[PDB]
């Protein structure tokens, strides 16, 4: 059940995987609204994976621990500062969280892509699994795949004013199980922006 991946020019296939878990669509919604005067121009060279280190659960962890990374975050290289030279830019997202199970860890970690989340009161974390989610247990599958299309106002978004998405890696499994396995398994999330668009460019300072 090896899973292939590809975006732009870089790719890393998971040795074992569960399979993609789509959300809220199968493909992006209509792209050039009659509101934005059609100045949109698709950009191809801007979707490449970019590693980004996240919190790693250790034994001390209570179920309640939650963690949310503001998406999208500061980018360097191709697709880095592109948002700056454009406004009302839109993109779907292909997140990918990878962790090392050790084939010996009882604890189960669940990650859900959520839109416009506000800090929770720790009482909805239970029902959090409503949004698109795929949730991993190092027994079977050490990585999860999630692709969402953007949802918020349909025509465009200003990523400097309001982020419309977030990662939430809350650990569903109580604590962690040290059953002859690595004590701390840091989780890595290979965020991957797919199918961007852009609109009216800022006056540069170059």
């Amino acid at each position, epitope marked *: 059940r090896i899973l292939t991946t590809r975006n732009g020019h870089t790719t890393s296939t998971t040795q074992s995987s569960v399979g993609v878990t789509y959300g809220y669509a199968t493909a992006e919604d209509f792209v050039s609204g009659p509101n934005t005067s059609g100045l949109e121009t698709r950009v191809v060279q801007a979707e490449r994976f970019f590693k980004t280190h996240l*919190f*790693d659960w*250790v*034994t*001390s962890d*209570p179920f*309640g621990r939650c*963690y949310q*990374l503001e998406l999208p975050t500061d980018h360097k290289g191709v697709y880095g500062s592109l948002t700056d030279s454009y406004a009302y830019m839109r993109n779907g997202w292909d997140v990918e969280v990878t962790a090392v199970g050790n084939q010996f860890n009882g604890g189960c970690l669940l990650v859900a892509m959520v839109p416009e989340l506000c800090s929770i009161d720790k009482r909805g974390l239970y029902q959090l699994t409503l949004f698109p989610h795929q949730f991993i247990n190092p027994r079977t599958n050490m990585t999860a795949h999630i692709t969402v299309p953007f949802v918020g106002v349909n025509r465009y978004d200003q990523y400097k004013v309001h982020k419309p998405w977030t990662l939430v890696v809350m650990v569903v499994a109580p604590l962690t199980v040290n059953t002859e396995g690595a004590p*701390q398994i840091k989780v890595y999330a290979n965020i991957a922006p797919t199918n961007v668009h852009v609109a009216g460019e800022f006056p540069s300072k170059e």
Partner: antibody
Amino acid sequence: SGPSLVKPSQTLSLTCTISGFSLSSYTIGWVRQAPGKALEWIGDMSNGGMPYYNPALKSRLSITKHNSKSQVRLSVSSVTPEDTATYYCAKSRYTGDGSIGLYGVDAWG
Amino acid sequence: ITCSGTYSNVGTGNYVSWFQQIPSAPRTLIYSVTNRASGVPDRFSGSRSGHTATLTISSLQAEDEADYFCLSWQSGNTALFGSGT
């Protein structure tokens, strides 16, 4: 709670170990703290014989894991004059060893 | 009080609470995200924010000497980092 020695190259020994309660079912930790400098957890002990020291000081550092007399003897060789700091018998509730030093963690505090 | 602190070091899923009553044991089991260990529960209670901000207590008068320490687990360099005060 002593600054030990700096000039001697011998491994620092801090057997502040008293049987208030045992090391039998609990965790015990070791911290470096100078008059003023950054604080590092030299090491710690949890039931299961799985104690891990800090990554930066990995080879030169070692803590004795004996349950008799509820003792703990630091085994740190190649000690440099800059290892001038006060250490403390530090106690945690259980399974807080993880791999490297953690505190500020909830339900672990 | 507050310390100077990157978001990724303690901000992305970290806990800061480290308490001392130095004048001389810095080892007082004492914490700030929560008010357990029995000692110093009232008027010394703190909390942490969405990014570096550090415990707060009741104002306009001071009933403790020197000042307190802050400790945060740091993800970049596996060794624990603690300083400032």
